[model samples]
Target: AIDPNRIVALEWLPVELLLALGIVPYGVADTINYRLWVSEPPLPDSVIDVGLRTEPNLELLTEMKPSFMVWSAGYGPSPEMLARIAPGRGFNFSDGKQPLAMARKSLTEMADLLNLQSAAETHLAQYEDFIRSMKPRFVKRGARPLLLTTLIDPRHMLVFGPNSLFQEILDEYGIPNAWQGETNFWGSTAVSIDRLAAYKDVDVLCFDHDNSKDMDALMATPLWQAMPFVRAGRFQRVPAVWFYGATLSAMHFVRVLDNAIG
Candidate 1:
């Protein structure tokens, strides 16, 4: 008997999308880091680990008997290979400029496959409610134009731009973005800390999850301390969310940004 519910996630976003509809995946790739990076809709302990996302274990997948598999489109094994194991779907995350929009469409796509359209709508209502509830908070707080960033090293940081999930969320919340620079298809730019000085009086918010992000190292620099926002007590490092996530990622960002701005 084929188990409709015994689906497998080949990437992190697939795990999130499945969980958005209250479906627990039978297996997930890189379960260890999923806990660290995309921990909102947490993976269950009973779920099996199926090796790396790009290099999933064929031996394990063959026996797992998953009804289907999900992966980020254009990455990992081809659908032809996945078809041999079981039918699967791939989601295109970065193909379009509007990733958040892409996320909504893909969630419905997956829900349709699972016959969980109502479930998806219910979750979306909840997601919409969160945004409505939080929108006014920023307005009342006099939220400034924000420069969203994640540190990669003491000197270099990845800054989110107009096309990013973070930026789109801010747009929904009526918040402003200070970054007007270039970004890749993923909607982020890597540049030195000094480049940030171009945007004056902007609150600098960094998503930080570990010491490797090097918060202390960046703050210690004389050049960093002199930035207008830093001197004005507007530089902050909040706990990181999966900046690459979709609806759930937006939810997490709203929660994090609300608290950070508070």
Candidate 2:
């Protein structure tokens, strides 16, 4: 068994989990992208970057000799290689299960491993408080149906469905998801601009990924200009919110949504 004191996280989800428990991993994969996407809980400046998530630097891992390596089930390097350096554990939050429940479960399991149950409990309480306080405020707004998407290019988007973390947050607030289409385990579906016709008159919450040029190109396209939401000026740009993240990301979405709708 490996001690959780000195750990290396190979994906943004686990990194967020560790940071939520007030423990910074000795290293994280793709630290640059993680900073860009998962902005909450603030990663430490001293944490080392072990390299990309798909193929982390093995030599760096051997040198760091972390007590354990933590990663999502299908995202990181081979389990065998990770085991060679240190004990490795894989977490899966996308088994066609409820994303919010799985996120809470992951936090509890991590707390047990790191002996940070007290901190975890405190954080969970805070999460509940955020949901409780925000729900009524949204209810007062009366059914602000939302169409959530992240632009994949100038022509297509990854639309979020009811199974997504964003949907779970919206559900708590008595808001309805406008995208009734199907979604994969990741709670998103890639579709061209025409598919958005189903969500006519809904407020579009587009998650921006530091891509102003992409937005400009999208606005220039005839297909984008024809959408009902676009024509009515119902679109709002939101900062990067990790679609596959934990409770903290959920809270971030709640705050941003509240501000946008207000």
Candidate 3:
């Protein structure tokens, strides 16, 4: 039958929202090494593991028979595949550059789909008021703080670059992103560790790690260790929560920023 609470999440942000709303998905895309990178509360015991990246177990998905399946368009799963699973019942909420607005819209749509329109409206109004109250807190702060993300693979040292949702978020907080180069739709650009040395004067370093085990590995890298922000202790490992998609979970992100600045 139809079950609003029995969700199936293909991306992290939706799962974060379900959890925030006190609903648990019947299944979640498996994120190997999440503990290393994800600091949010543990996934629920009821969440079945689906395969990772571009691979999902069709057999397992068929068995779950989720009343509705939610996925981000950014991640692949052909229209045929979605049709086979639920027949015109899939929700696509990944608009990349416009994820926040997409998320708000998604919430409204999902609520309507589940006959929870009132809940959706209440949540939207609350967040709108919250944003209005918050806009002024960062307004007269003068120069925006610089922000950067460091990913530690040798071949692809990626960072959040220009024209990104994260950049907009930082801008809202009167924070500036240091990397100005072009980036993919995901707001990511690959650069050399040596390149970051140029921004040693940057105020904050935001790091995303998939495996907590690599925390030391990242720190031990000579280039990473020598970075001025690291030396000055301005480097902060953003909790895995915000590393994923945008949703109401963003409030948690802002809260973390508040704590960091305070």
Candidate 4:
């Protein structure tokens, strides 16, 4: 069995899972940017940075000499190369299954690896309770479909579809996603602003990061200003929810959506 005491995570989801287990990882990739995006269960400063996710500093990784390494198929160095340094594992959320469901499963599996099965179950219970409490309020608001998207540029936007984590949360609350267009495995599609016209009468929940000033630029565009959601005052700018994140992020989004819509 791999020792959990000296673990390194190369992607954001695993880092969040490790934090939830009350185990600070020895190292992580792109630690700086992770702090900016993932707000809850804050990452500690002592965790060493192994470099970029796509090409982690193998030299620094080797220096850490972690007992085990974790990575995601979405982005990172090859697992074969990383394995040469240490026994490692890879996680992929795009396996034609619901991302949120996979996240819960991964949580238990990670806990088993870390010998923190109790901690994982406790966290899962808390998540389930939170969902149960929030469901009624959401259902009471009526089933007005919601459009989840992020500002990509003045000309384009990234829209969340049925295959996304956001969709899974919406499904749990008995809500609906507005964007029914095609989506990739990760559950998002980049489309022109005109595409949003289809759901102009529904809620538009746009995710925003601190540097997402492009949203302002989008607001200034004639097409955006003329969009139905804009004129009807249905546009809602939600807080940062890591679209690519795991269970914690899914819960964070639920809390944000409750505050926004309820």
Candidate 5:
């Protein structure tokens, strides 16, 4: 019998962890066209592209005959559709607050479903150990640097606010997000470009420009060029890591930050 937890993920976040754990799904959905958006660092070759999550190729899924399907709330097909295929369901990966804790919780949940609590505990232990090792290295820098995706159309631009998963990652590295204001738990907040002027004096601008159109448009904006980070060349656009959910891929992100910020 196939493992119950051998999940066909409809999002990249879960795929990240599954890949890390050497668990390949029978079927996988490409929520975002990583090839189009991120050319150089493409999606791992192992994944089977079942097309977009919202409108996946049902025929392909049927052919794969996956044991179970897993997805997040915003990125996947409707619950009703998944029910028709297999026992498809979602979890709370979107919880932005206490990201590390939430990730650990979800790992346990997945383990419970798989009857692999021992393996899950081993994963968590390794994760915790990695975090502990990195904390001291980043903390010695004295202050957390202000982290943001970019500075563009301020009125409609998106900013990662307080209590976000990205913010928590920055916190572990002794980096503070410059925009620590009220925001929705999982999604982003709309803020004016003028407001970001205050943060021009801060540290790095960690831009998650995942879309080609949006990235080009933001770069063309005059306000974006006028930002001090841009002029001073402190701005760096990193790869589009897990935006909506948490997984072991966070370790890769932390490594990227260490290499970039150090």
Candidate 6:
């Protein structure tokens, strides 16, 4: 039997999903980064720090004796290895093409596995209602295609494409994504900053709390200075959120994006 309070999450995506199902992970990898990234669902301080997501401490897992381990999209330990540590499940959350569909399916699958079907249903209803309520807000924000990107440096940016979780939520609100280019299984493409020059009529933005020298360098560049959005003061930054997270994370994103749109 799975102990709802004794679950371990190997990534922020799994962490958020587990929290949505009303199970606080007994331990989570990179709790610090999870707080900084996936801020919603609010991982409690009581949740043990199990170390890095890529290489969670085996010793820590042994210490906690978690009833279950969960990971998404091939992240963290292999399912076979995690099963050895405890009963475990791995999901295809970062599956390319329609990721939001996979996210919902995985959430239900996990809920069914943990016998938390009612909790999953409740959370999904809240998810639907949350987005529906935001419809009027987004409508008021207007209908221009919005470019979503994260600045990696002065030269490059990670642009969210049509297949990403960000794209899914934006599509729900009738917001068009500007980047229709190829993206990876996680639904983001690393392209040169200059590529954004092609999108002259859209509002360009990012979802990160990036306040570093790289942004300063990028802001001073001739290319950035000459960009249409930059010139028109159409570029802005929203509150940081884990763009790869589940429905609760998506709702947090909507809230931040709404505040910034105003």
Segments of candidate 6 deviating more than 4 angstroms: none
| Model 4 per-residue lDDT tens digits across residues 3-103 | 77789999988887888787889998988778767766578888898988887999988888899888876567878888999888777665654888888
Residue-pair clash count for candidate 2 = 0
Residues 218-244, candidate 3: write the lDDT tens digits: 667887889887787767766544454
lDDT of 3 at 62: 87
lDDT (Cα, tens digit) per residue for candidate 2, span 7-26:
99988888888888888688
- Cα-based TM-score, every candidate: 0.91, 0.95, 0.82, 0.94, 0.81, 0.93
Which residue pairs come into collision in candidate 5?
144-174, 144-175, 144-176, 149-207, 154-192, 154-193
Evaluated against the true structure, the overall lDDT of model 1 is 0.83
Q: Which run of 10 residues does model 4 get worst, by summed lDDT?
A: 88-97
TM-score of structure candidate 6: 0.93
- What is the C-alpha lDDT profile of model 6 across 1-262, one tens digit per residue? 2788888888888888888888878989998887666766787889999999999999989888888888886666787888899888887875678777887888898899899999999989998898888877877766788898887777888898998888878887888898899998888889998788888889888766444677788889999899998888889866677878778777887888788773
Worst 10 residues of 6 by lDDT: 206-215
| Residue pairs with backbone overlap in model 6 | none
lDDT of 4 at 135: 85
Native-structure RMSD, model 1: 2.2
Q: How many collisions per candidate?
A: 0, 0, 1, 0, 6, 0
- Tell how far residue 139 is off in model 4, in angstroms: 2.9
Candidate order (TM-score): 2, 4, 6, 1, 3, 5
How do the residues 1-262 of candidate 1 rate in per-residue lDDT, one tens digit apiece? 1355789989887788889988888999989877766676678899899998889999999998888888988778888889889888888775547788888888888889888899999988898888888877777655568889988888788999888888777887677888878988778889998898787778888887665548888888898888878888888888777877778988998888988884
Off by over 4 Å in 3: 17-22, 31-42, 88-96, 132-141, 152-155, 208-213
lDDT of each: 0.83, 0.83, 0.63, 0.83, 0.64, 0.82
Candidate 3 vs candidate 6: the lDDT winner is: 6
